[PDB]
Ligand binder design. Structure first.
Ligand SMILES: Nc1ncnc2c1ncn2[C@@H]1O[C@H](COP(=O)(O)OP(=O)(O)OP(=O)(O)OP(=O)(O)OP(=O)(O)OC[C@H]2O[C@@H](n3cnc4c(N)ncnc43)[C@H](O)[C@@H]2O)[C@@H](O)[C@H]1O
Length: 135
């Protein structure tokens, strides 16, 4: 879920682009401290935010995770990524959660929307908001 100081695009960047350590246990502390729980799994794409914005310009397709949405876009090329999986869940001390890390080279599908009018920078009228699938 999204903390209130984020737009959807800023939250996408925080969860899926800004991997603050190459180790999942460390990188996941940021997400988990913002969500107040240990997220069970999460992908970080080793690409730039601008590259994702350009994927939002690729043809629209149906989102595989929800057949009623048509705001998804295929990456066209594969990228390197790291997928983090929770190995150790620490209910009453989220900083003690630990993760496994899996490196891969995969395509991705992102949902994009119009930016948040009040809070997102006008530089990018169209922004990624959800990571629908890795393939
Ligand atoms: N087998 C597997 N292999 C690899 N990865 C796997 C996997 N199984 C699960 N995953 C991924 O693991 C993560 C954890 O899933 P899960 O463990 O199932 O839990 P979750 O954290 O409660 O769920 P969220 O959907 O809210 O996850 P998120 O914050 O990552 O969502 P996202 O940034 O994409 O989206 C942000 C928000 O966008 C919103 N949204 C969904 N669809 C659209 C859409 N078309 N357009 C705009 N917003 C949309 C929702 O509110 C969503 O919360 C989810 O990304 C999932 O996709």
């Amino acid at each position: 879920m999204k903390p209130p100081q984020f737009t959807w695009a800023q939250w996408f960047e925080t969860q899926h682009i800004n991997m603050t350590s190459q180790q999942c246990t460390n990188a996941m502390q940021v997400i988990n401290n913002y969500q107040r729980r240990c997220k069970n799994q999460n992908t970080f794409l080793l690409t730039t935010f601008a590259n994702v914005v350009n994927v939002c310009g690729n043809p629209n397709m149906t989102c595989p995770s929800n057949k009623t949405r048509k705001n998804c876009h295929h990456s066209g090329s594969q990228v390197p990524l790291i997928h983090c999986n929770l190995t150790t869940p620490s209910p009453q001390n989220i900083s003690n959660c630990r993760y496994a890390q899996t490196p891969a080279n995969m395509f991705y599908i992102v949902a994009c929307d119009n930016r948040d009018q009040r809070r997102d920078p006008p530089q990018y009228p169209v922004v990624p908001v959800h990571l629908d699938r890795i393939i």
